[PDB]
Amino acid sequence: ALKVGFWPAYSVSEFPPSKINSRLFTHLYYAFAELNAPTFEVRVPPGSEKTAEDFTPTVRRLNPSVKTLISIGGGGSEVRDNFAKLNSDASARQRFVKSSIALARRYGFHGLDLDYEYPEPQLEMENFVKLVSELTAAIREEARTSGKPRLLLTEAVYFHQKLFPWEVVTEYPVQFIAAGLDWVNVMAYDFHGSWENFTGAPAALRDPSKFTASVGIESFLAAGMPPEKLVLGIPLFGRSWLLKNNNEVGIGAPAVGAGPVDGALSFSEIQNFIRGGAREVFDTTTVSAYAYKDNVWVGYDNQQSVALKVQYAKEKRLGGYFFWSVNQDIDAILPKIASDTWG
């Protein structure tokens, strides 16, 4: 059972790695190493070398069995642009592969992760295939020469197997992925947010809508992905809106922009929101929660919806679950219920 957490280096001042409850995880990811175009000598952001080095020893002090991976990239457009430039250039791909493996060993990580959002259109999938095939081979070669177990290799994927389900330009090659990677982290959230002028469940497990975690998972399984290669993503943040009218507070209510903070609110801040007078509602239709006060509305996962999602993952025979990102639940409320549920 994979119990995965992502720790983002940006959060180091307020949430250093020592604050992670690593007893609740099997694998903890450092986010992110940078691609470092144009050389593509992959590296942690200069100035964070000590934080990167200390990450794994620190988290293992509370749970020595926990393993770590370093994630390369991130969800931004600059990262996507850099992957697209990288993957078209065979020499650059070689530099990336060599440097990424050396990076993981340098800092004591047990694996590598690619966060490329997303390998589309078709040309970009084709070139990403070249990168990942070369990386898989180099990982196996390094295990042979070094004598150590091979580095784990994972990647972030869109919630759905098709890019995109409403207009298919390419799709994740599941047999390829299952052969070359240990698992994929399915980003089964961010379906709805302040970019829409109505409230919704940002990470709905299901809906009687096609943008749901279950529909996405179904698509990977239908394509032939071994269930154990799928790790279900669960957010530790909510998406927030400003309401058009304070007496329209349910799902589908009209909205007029992003709520705090610029449309995203950590679970810990949502707990504060509720303690400060917001009303929490569990929505059984979507398997999600929302909370509102005056003109602010936030959709998120709570103790009930997380337990239901984790049991869903168990019933669908998935490899496990992941949380993005662990700094957003400072008391580790949701990681605790998730771990208890799978156990």
Ligand X SMILES: CC(=O)N[C@H]1[C@H](O[C@H]2[C@@H](O)[C@@H](NC(C)=O)[C@H](O[C@H]3[C@H](O)[C@H]4N=C(N(C)C)O[C@H]4[C@@H]3CO)O[C@@H]2CO)O[C@H](CO)[C@@H](O)[C@H]1O
Residues with catalytic annotation? 117
Q: Which stretch binds ligand X (CB under 6 A): 48-56, 67-75, 203-211, 270-278?
A: 67-75
Q: Residue 73 CB, nearest distance to ligand X (Å)?
A: 8
Gyration radius from the chain CA atoms: 20
Q: Which stretch binds ligand X (CB under 6 A): 62-70, 184-192, 243-251, 331-339?
A: 184-192
User: Measured from the CB atom, is 142 or 329 closer to ligand X?
Assistant: 329
How many whole angstroms separate alpha carbon 199 and alpha carbon 116?
A: 28
Q: Which stretch binds ligand X (CB under 6 A): 68-76, 243-251, 270-278, 304-312?
A: 68-76
Distance of alpha carbon 99 from the chain centroid: 23
**Interactions with ligand X, residue window 21-60 (CB under 6 A):** none
For residue 342, count other CB atoms closer than 10 A to its CB. Answer: 16
**Interactions with ligand X, residue window 103-132 (CB under 6 A):** 115
Nearest in space to 230 (alpha carbons), one of 318, 312, 162: 318
Distance of alpha carbon 194 from the chain centroid: 20
How many whole angstroms separate alpha carbon 187 and alpha carbon 318?
A: 14
Among 72, 152, 264, 338, binds ligand X (CB under 6 A): 264
Do the Cβ atoms of 20 and 9 come closer than 8 Å? Answer: no
Q: Which stretch binds ligand X (CB under 6 A): 44-52, 120-128, 182-190, 200-208?
A: 182-190
Is residue 157 close enough to count as binding ligand X by CB under 6 A?
no
Helix, strand, coil fractions of the chain, as percent rounded to 5:
40, 25, 35
CA–CA distances in Å: residue 217 to residues 84, 161, 223: 26, 8, 10
Is residue 74 close enough to count as binding ligand X by CB under 6 A?
yes
Among 182, 190, 207, 301, binds ligand X (CB under 6 A): 190
Do the Cβ atoms of 138 and 98 come closer than 8 Å? Answer: yes
Is residue 260 close enough to count as binding ligand X by CB under 6 A?
no
Among 87, 234, 324, 329, binds ligand X (CB under 6 A): 324
Farthest-apart Cα atoms in the chain, separation: 66
Is residue 231 close enough to count as binding ligand X by CB under 6 A?
no
Q: Count residues contacting ligand X (CB under 6 A)?
A: 16
The pair of three-digit structure tokens given for residue 65, joined into one six-digit string: 């069995």
Is residue 75 close enough to count as binding ligand X by CB under 6 A?
yes
Is residue 211 close enough to count as binding ligand X by CB under 6 A?
no
Query: Which residues bind to ligand X, rule: CB under 6 A?
Result: 6, 10, 71, 74-76, 115, 156, 185, 187, 190, 233, 237, 264, 324-325
